[PDB]
Amino acid sequence: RKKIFKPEELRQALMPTLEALYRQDPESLPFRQPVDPQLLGIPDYFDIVKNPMDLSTIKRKLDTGQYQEPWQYVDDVWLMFNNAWLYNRKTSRVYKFCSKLAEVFEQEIDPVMQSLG
Ligand SMILES: COc1ccc(N2C(=O)CC[C@H]2c2nc(-c3ccc4onc(C)c4c3)cn2C[C@H](C)N2CCOCC2)cc1Cl
């Protein structure tokens, strides 16, 4: 199942799945930039979340060819969702928004991954 991908071929296949998340309004709004614990008054954020991730950083990594293989991109999207579910209470708006994005991503990513082999 080893395959070498060109970064531009990955960017072209995967960026639409990331665009699908950015289009979710308001559910993508918390996810568009890195969590700033100072600005948001959540000083315990980096006690809990040791590997932060957000849409801006994933987009930057696609734009600079830092994903060799499609599973590395999927791992960062899942990291972003797993961090939000870990930090936020199950009852919170951000947790619910995370769950919405995860549903959208599952629908978008499945056929793209099948198409990349
Ligand atoms: C419309 O949706 C929102 C509006 C405001 C807020 N916020 C507040 O109620 C207070 C601060 C602000 C806010 N919180 C968070 C927050 C917090 C905990 C988090 O864990 N993981 C993540 C990701 C995460 C994000 C982010 N924000 C900024 C807020 C979403 N703004 C982003 C810029 O456009 C306007 C709305 C959250 C949401 Cl969901």
Domain that holds residue 79: 1-117
SS3 content of the chain, % helix, strand, coil (to 5): 70, 0, 30
CATH number of the domain where residue 40 is located: 1.20.920.10
Tell me the best of 40, 47, 82 to mutate to test the pocket of ligand 1, counting ligand atoms within 8 Å of each CB and taking the most. Answer: 40
The protein residue with its alpha carbon nearest to ligand 1, atom 36, reads 29
- Experimental resolution (Å): 1.4
Nearest to 22 by CA among 33, 12, 37, 13: 33
The C-alpha atoms of residue 82 and residue 86 are separated, in whole angstroms, by: 6
Name the experimental technique: X-ray
55 lines ligand 1 (CB under 6 A): no
